[PDB]
Amino acid sequence: SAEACGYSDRVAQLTLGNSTITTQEAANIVVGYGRWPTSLRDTDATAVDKPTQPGVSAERFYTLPSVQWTNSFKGHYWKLPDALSELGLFGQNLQFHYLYRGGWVIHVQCNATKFHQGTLLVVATPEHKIQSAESPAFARTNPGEQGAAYQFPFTFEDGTALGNALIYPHQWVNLRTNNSATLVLPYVNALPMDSGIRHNNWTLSVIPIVPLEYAAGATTYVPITVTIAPMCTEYNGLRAAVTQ
């Protein structure tokens, strides 16, 4: 037994709504700050209208466009909820409401072969600011479902050390060991709820720290795929649809 001998099995299945994700080379599952997503308590709430809780229509896995691990690859990132703001009913509920609150289940995928070597840091950073520029471009602060390429990985795009990003919930995809990373993230903010079109609570980054190399002649085209599922979500302040 996995829990008997005290280790973590390398296989995993994530089922939410009408979607199921499997992996046979995982490295346990991270639960950000040891906290699973939770509903807003009556003693923490402030907005008085009865919230909307879409359930399975929004709490399911959404797969975003894949990214290629090129030779010059510096890394890629996605803002949440920005990246899903226009996908399925999660996106619709986000657009039609002023307030949103929710957690996430993130699954990053990248397989190669036992003839390849490389290492990706997969980190979920709370309040990750893209401030390498005097006046940040909207295209980079809110890249949408396509995400944006890193330009300053060493400084984590915010003036801190890449090596210290480990203080945030993370895992690594070390090709010789695993081909996927899974992170469960609770809602984090200084408020009980917030606007999903003006503020991104988390930023998912996939950064190559050890370049992709391989036996001469092996497959050179190696994609990285991100699948994300909103979890335990609720919305308040219904009105017409509004996007940023």
């Binding site: 973590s8 490295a27 346990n28 991270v30 639960v31 700050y33 040891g34 906290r35 699973w36 939770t38 923490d44 803002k79 709370p126 309040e127 990750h128 600011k129 401030q131 390498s132 520029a133 005097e134 006046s135 940040p136 471009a137 909207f138 602060t141 809110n142 300053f152 060493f154 400084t155 984590f156 915010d158 003036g159 801190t160 050390a161 210290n164 990003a165 203080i167 945030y168 919930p169 993370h170 895992q171 690594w172 995809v173 070390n174 060991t177 695993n178 990373a181 992170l183 984090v188 200084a190 408020l191 009980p192 606007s195 079109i197 003006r198 503020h199 991104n200 609570n201 509004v242 940023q244």
Partner: protein, 271 residues
Amino acid sequence: GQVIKSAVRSTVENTVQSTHSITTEATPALQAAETGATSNASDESMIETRNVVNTHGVAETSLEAFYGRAGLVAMFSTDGGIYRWYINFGEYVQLRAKLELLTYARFDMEFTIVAQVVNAQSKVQDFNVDYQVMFVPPGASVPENQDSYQWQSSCNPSVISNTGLPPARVSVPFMSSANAYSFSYDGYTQFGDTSGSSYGIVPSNYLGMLVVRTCEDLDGTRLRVRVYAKPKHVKGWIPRSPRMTPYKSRYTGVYTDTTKFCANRARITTA
């Protein structure tokens, strides 16, 4: 809910005597950083240890001990007998860098004001004068001159002291409209605007301004003022990666890119 407990300790962990181990079962040294977990190998498992009743405390690294002391947040001289300082801690880097070690934090503050009179050549004078520091919340009218009506301060809190008395000092509670101050905000200040100038700043962190004046006009001299702030009753959440590049702007975290943090050495094999 919370699946990982947080029991409290008042001293660091003791060391227990251990003996040799020759087995195929227990392998404490083998790890897997890919999981995202920090190694769990203990000293007792890697080498043979002795008993050490360690009474070292942990007090000086508590949030209260780390943040609980005054730091400069403002320094200026009056002009025309008045000065308007917008309350924010981005001007002086030391305290700023400390606060940015946390994502969210609640705390009260103790403000201390040290003021002196200086002449045109910026030479200090032994001259006792009464000065007034008025807190003007956003929305209240800010005085234009040293003698404007707003100085009546019937609602705005004001503190009147003298350069001949000890530094002025008052406490302020946790005043944000939010449930915690935020030292990192990945969002915009308003709907309908995506210009870079309005990115990365949470407005609720700005509680107003301090306007200062000498109660009466100085003759040829100015009032030099330093404002210190000391966090109290600190509660913090989500530790952050420390600043690793110089600050360049007072309101943004913009920085100059670099290819190294520490200085280079001849070779990786020579310590």
